[PDB]
Amino acid sequence: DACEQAAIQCVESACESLCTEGEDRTGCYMYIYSNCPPYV
Numbered sequence: 638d639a640c641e642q643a644a645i646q647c648v649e650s651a652c653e654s655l656c657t658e659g660e661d662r663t664g665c666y667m668y669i670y671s672n673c674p675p676y677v
Contacts, residue, residue, distance in 0.1 A: 639655040639656075640652070640655045640657070640661055640662075641665075642655075643655045643665060644665040644669055645668070647669055647672075647673035649665075649666065651665075652665035652666055
């Protein structure tokens with residue numbers, strides 16, 4: 638879905654608009670922190 642795809646592009650700002658509140662949004666930030674520059 639759009640949420641997952643935003644996470645994989647490393648665009649945190651899009652987690653808010655493309656992911657549901659709660660777990661989905663948290664999971665988008667956690668992915669970014671785990672796998673995107675400059676976190677890696």
